[PDB]
Design a protein around this nucleic acid. Structure first.
Lengths: 216, 128, 348, 195, 100
RNA sequence: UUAGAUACCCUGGUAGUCCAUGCCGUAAACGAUGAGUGUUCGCCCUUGGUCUACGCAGAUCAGGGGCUCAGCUAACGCGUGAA
RNA sequence: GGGGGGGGCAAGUGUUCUUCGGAAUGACUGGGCGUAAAGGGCACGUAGGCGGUGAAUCGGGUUGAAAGUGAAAGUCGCCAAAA
């Protein structure tokens, strides 16, 4: 059905290309008697062509991961302008974690206006044994720093809130982590992202010789 | 530990992340030659041809392109053989890897060779 | 110790001994066997590679050591050398993953024997190949009776018996070399081949043919060697070939037949029989049975030295001097029709 | 080899020093730098192969040019060849400009088509192939954004912010000969290829 | 990850669905070269120190200094006989190019 | 001059400025950037040395000054570092 | 503030005092000092720290092994009884 409607929209846009190419290539002569149709069918092309990039909003362009949210209230001062900013994080418990950030005019509207963009710009994290991370690592954003140490299988998640709700639905279960410096939100996000993407698992460390045993 | 050592190691690291592939270090040393070789046969470089055994000083090291932060210690400190199991936890990736390099009476080791031979000495460098 | 270079997904077990010209000993071949039996069941490694040293790729098989270790009379000291070269080359053939080999030096004797039964083979201008074991008293051994038996009409019976040079252009023309390159720009393809995180051969072949087969321009290599040979080496028995060549102590092309005459005369007579006991038999069998085929011959013509001289070649060629030693008490004139089966007995 | 003779005749390996890369220069001649023409040819091998393979799935290509010296050389292609659309070839004639390749599904509705063209076609080009100096930068940026591979001619003049996020660089270096037939190689390709 | 391997890891860990250029992208890797240092060597024709000083006088010597270096292994100051030969070739060539 | 004027505006005008020797010992004593050593993509300059010159510069040192690849920085920005 | 209703704890609850953590808020582990607090006006030089190479020797530091001691209680592992 997906391909059905895709090529169908393509049929629409192909009749668009046809007639509008014809009209364009008739530049020569009297003006109105082609421009009327010009405007009509181009407006039609708009209505149809934008529905492709419309689709991602609700049904597809929407997987079955889970999402979580952030939000604050920016300002402009032409009079006393007020708006809303909001953040979202998608994750599937296997580790595909992604996020997104966008603005709107009211809370639920901003939550929404990201609810269909969190599913783009995806980065894929490699959770070592389905419960924890491959090693210890420090990683810093501009002025937020981060420390990741694994734990053996039974402790549990020892992290904060903004970092817990990422290491949770990435698929980790026994990480201990320390974020230090700025206690901001959107830097801890993208700090976790600049961090987890930094771990080089033994698959990676086989960047040179040596099969790295696990100690059994 | 000296500072010409720190110098050799940092010149290595900075040439690496600059992207050149073959460098030359003027003030050479035996503890530095040993360390270049140690890195080599642990994998981190490609050739380490020292030139003048005496009286002049020149090494030409040609490099692979691995991570290599490898800070070279300055303030001496002991290392027994049974203390590495906890001391090499203060490298960058505390758990996984990096080879704290130790000096012994039986030649300059790394921490694997050390904890095998059950010999000690003094720390000199790191690996990441 | 053999030089294991472990790049990302391209391990390469480069045996070497630049004092022994990159010759081969039982330890070296056995260690390579260990490496390959380990690598076969490995998800990490993708393919395997074969290199040498700065001078040459492969030269000799320590048969000097084998005479010095057979003048005493221990069966196993030689039977094991040969068993673990044979089963080695069988493995070489039977491996689950691609096998690249490089050639620049004087690959000789068993030189190509390790390499060719793999996937790909890169040559160089100064690659120079021959198989003078008939000139030690021995035979082209361990699958040479495969990768030469399969060849243009009566051309393997040129190569093995006489033992002429096989250089780069020659091997890319005659398909002995799968690809060709230049010396100073070989690591150029080495890193290209190493960094690839790819599995199926169908794409490594393309990535290497990038810098693989790009010159076939020969105008004097085998231009008419083919039909020069189709007159003589298309006969039945070595002595008939050479008698027709004595008839071809000719007038026009003689500057060709004279030198091949001498090149053959530099070889033992019964061994000049075993080379045809090799090819004109293995031109239709596979490699593990052409392997055991030469295996019985190798174990026999060393212990059961009854008419050839397996040790005088060793004693002269290297030890004394490359003067033709007296490997020919019964020259080809009187070589029993059953001398070759007196070698080839344990066919059972 | 003989092809290297031909490249060397093609006034190509030599171009003034405005460089960030040196993996390429055979030397210099004080008014030129000589790149490694064998590397030139090897780059051509790889990229042309890539396009002739992408063929085997028939994915849209959408060349890009803005310096109309090649205009004729290129226009012999992209119409009845490759993309096959002469009408789109007219977009390419007068394109690269506006909201591009990432907000491709823009309205753009307002024409008032007085001595304007205003094409605005829309479909994901699964690979890009360009050749000009710098005005086209939007295509490179947006391709790198949306993970679209690119083939591009790079002279010594290329900032790192392009030279490193464009795959498949053809360091051809157009120079004293200016624009000469090159694209006829990719003309060979994709035609008498798709079987 | 790099533009070529990022995408592979992505699709393998099943982030997004496959692009239509992947099988060909891997089949035609990018043309990498050995990582070399700075120092673009100044490369020179062996016959530099005289063409500069001779085109001063009067292309063809820009390569005929080779046909002079060939005997240059025992050349004392054969610059004079070289410029003489150049006089000869120019004399005859311009006789011809005025007869045309 | 102003509501008023210790002021700014005008005209006078000593101490002070200057020299000799002494005393203080402070300034936004401000590249608001301690001192030193090694490694770093270039271009533009430029003060004074050096080598090489054959139409003309090319090279090499010490400095002083912009502009930049990268690197860093909360932000500006520096990059003879604030790498 | 009063009436009702509900949460958290529970023979205990709540306030204050008291000390640590959070507090990287004295940063050895675990900072800074251009514009935010913080580079001295500048140097000299005393201790003091730290600081080239290769060859030799000694064995103080260093380091390998043994015994003595490092009270018992305590922390901790196990074990068992005890509720």
């Amino acid at each position: 059905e997906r391909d059905d409607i895709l090529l169908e929209k393509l049929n629409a846009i192909d009749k668009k290309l046809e007639i509008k190419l014809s009209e364009l290539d008739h530049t020569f002569g009297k003006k109105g008697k082609r421009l009327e149709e010009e405007i009509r069918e181009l407006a039609e092309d708009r209505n149809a062509l934008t529905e492709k990039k419309r689709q991602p909003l609700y049904r597809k362009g929407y997987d079955v991961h889970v999402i979580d949210v952030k939000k604050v209230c920016k300002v402009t001062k032409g009079g006393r302008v007020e708006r809303y900013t909001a953040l979202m994080v998608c994750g599937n418990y296997e580790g595909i974690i992604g996020y997104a950030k966008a603005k709107a005019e009211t809370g639920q509207s901003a939550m929404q206006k990201a609810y269909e963009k969190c599913f783009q710009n995806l980065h894929y994290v490699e959770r070592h044994e389905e419960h924890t991370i491959a090693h210890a690592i420090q990683t810093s954003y501009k002025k937020t720093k981060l420390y990741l140490w694994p734990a053996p299988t039974t402790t549990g998640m020892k992290a904060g809130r903004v970092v817990k709700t990422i290491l949770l639905l990435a698929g980790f279960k026994n990480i201990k982590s320390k974020v230090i410096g700025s206690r901001n939100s959107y830097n801890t996000v993208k700090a976790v992202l600049k961090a987890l993407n930094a771990v080089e698992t033994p698959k990676d460390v086989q960047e040179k010789f040596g099969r790295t045993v696990v100690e059994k | 530990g000296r500072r010409i050592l720190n110098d050799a190691l940092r010149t290595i690291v900075n040439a690496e992340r600059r992207g050149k592939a073959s460098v030359e270090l003027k003030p050479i040393s035996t503890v530095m030659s040993s360390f270049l070789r140690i890195m080599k046969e642990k994998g981190y470089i490609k050739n380490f041809q020292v030139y003048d055994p005496h009286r002049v000083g020149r090494i030409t090291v040609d490099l692979q392109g691995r991570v290599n932060d490898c800070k070279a210690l300055t303030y001496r400190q002991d290392v027994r053989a049974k203390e590495i199991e906890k001391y090499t936890e203060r490298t960058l990736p505390t758990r996984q890897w990096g080879y704290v390099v130790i000096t012994t009476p039986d030649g300059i080791l790394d921490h694997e060779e050390a904890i095998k031979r059950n010999v000690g000495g003094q720390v000199l460098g790191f690996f990441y | 110790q053999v030089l294991v270079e472990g790049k990302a997904k391209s391990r390469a077990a480069i045996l070497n001994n630049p004092s022994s010209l990159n010759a081969l000993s039982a330890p070296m071949v056995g260690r390579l066997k260990r490496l390959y039996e380990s690598w076969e069941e490995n998800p990490a490694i993708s393919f395997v590679l074969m290199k040498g040293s700065g001078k040459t790729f492969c030269s000799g098989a320590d048969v000097l050591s084998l005479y010095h270790s057979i003048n005493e009379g221990n069966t196993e000291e030689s039977k094991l050398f040969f068993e673990n070269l044979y089963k080695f080359v069988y493995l070489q053939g039977t491996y689950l993953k691609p096998n690249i080999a490089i050639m620049d030096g004087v690959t000789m004797g068993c030189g190509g024997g390790i390499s060719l039964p793999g996937m790909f083979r890169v040559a160089t201008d100064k690659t120079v190949l021959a198989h003078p074991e008939v000139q030690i008293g021995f035979h082209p051994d361990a699958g040479a009776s495969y990768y030469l038996s399969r060849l243009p009409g009566y051309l393997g019976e040129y190569l093995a018996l006489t033992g002429q040079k096989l250089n780069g252009v020659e091997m890319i023309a005659c398909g002995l070399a799968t690809h060709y390159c230049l010396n100073a720009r070989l690591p150029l393809i080495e890193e290209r081949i190493g960094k690839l995180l790819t599995d199926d051969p169908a794409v490594i072949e393309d990535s290497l043919a990038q810098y693989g087969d790009l010159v076939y321009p020969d105008s004097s290599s085998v231009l008419h060697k083919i039909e020069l040979i189709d007159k003589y080496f298309g006969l039945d028995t070595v002595e008939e070939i050479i008698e027709a060549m004595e008839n071809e102590a000719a007038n026009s092309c003689n500057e060709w037949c004279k030198k091949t005459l001498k090149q053959i005369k530099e070889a033992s007579p019964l061994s000049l029989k075993i080379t045809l006991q090799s090819i004109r038999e293995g031109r239709f069998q596979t490699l593990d049975q052409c392997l055991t085929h030469e295996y019985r011959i190798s174990i026999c013509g060393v212990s059961k030295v009854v008419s050839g001289d397996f040790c005088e070649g060793i004693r002269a060629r290297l030890v004394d001097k490359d003067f033709a030693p007296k490997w020919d008490p019964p020259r080809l004139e009187d070589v029993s029709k059953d001398m070759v089966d007196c070698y080839f007995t344990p066919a059972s | 080899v003989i092809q290297k003779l031909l490249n060397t005749g093609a006034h190509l390996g030599r171009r003034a020093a405005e460089h960030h890369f040196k993996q390429y220069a055979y030397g210099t001649r004080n008014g030129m730098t000589i790149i490694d023409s064998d590397k030139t040819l090897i780059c051509l091998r790889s990229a042309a192969h890539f396009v002739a393979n992408l063929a085997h799935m028939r994915g849209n290509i959408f060349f890009v040019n803005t310096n109309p010296l090649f205009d004729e050389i290129i226009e012999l292609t992209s119409r009845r060849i490759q993309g096959d659309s002469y009408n789109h070839n007219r977009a390419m004639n007068l394109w690269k400009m506006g909201g591009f390749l990432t907000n491709s599904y823009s309205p753009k509705k307002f024409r008032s088509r007085h001595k304007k063209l205003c094409f605005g076609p829309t479909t994901m080009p699964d690979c890009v192939v360009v050749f000009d100096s710098e005005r086209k930068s939007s295509v490179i940026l947006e391709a790198s954004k949306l993970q679209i591979p690119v083939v591009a001619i790079v002279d010594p003049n290329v900032p790192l912010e392009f030279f490193e996020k464009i795959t498949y660089p053809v360091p051809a270096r157009d120079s004293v000969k200016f624009v000469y037939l090159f694209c006829n190689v990719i003309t060979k390709c994709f035609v008498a290829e798709q079987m | 990850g790099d533009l070529l391997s990022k995408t592979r890891r992505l699709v393998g860990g099943l982030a997004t669905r496959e692009p239509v250029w992947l099988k060909a992208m891997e089949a035609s890797p990018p043309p990498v070269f050995p990582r070399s240092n700075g120092k673009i060597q100044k490369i020179v024709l062996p016959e530099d120190p005289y063409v500069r000083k001779f085109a001063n006088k009067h292309r063809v010597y820009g390569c005929r200094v080779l046909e002079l270096k060939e005997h240059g292994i025992s050349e004392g100051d054969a610059m004079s006989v070289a410029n003489m030969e150049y006089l000869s070739e120019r004399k005859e060539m311009k006789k011809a190019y005025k007869r045309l």
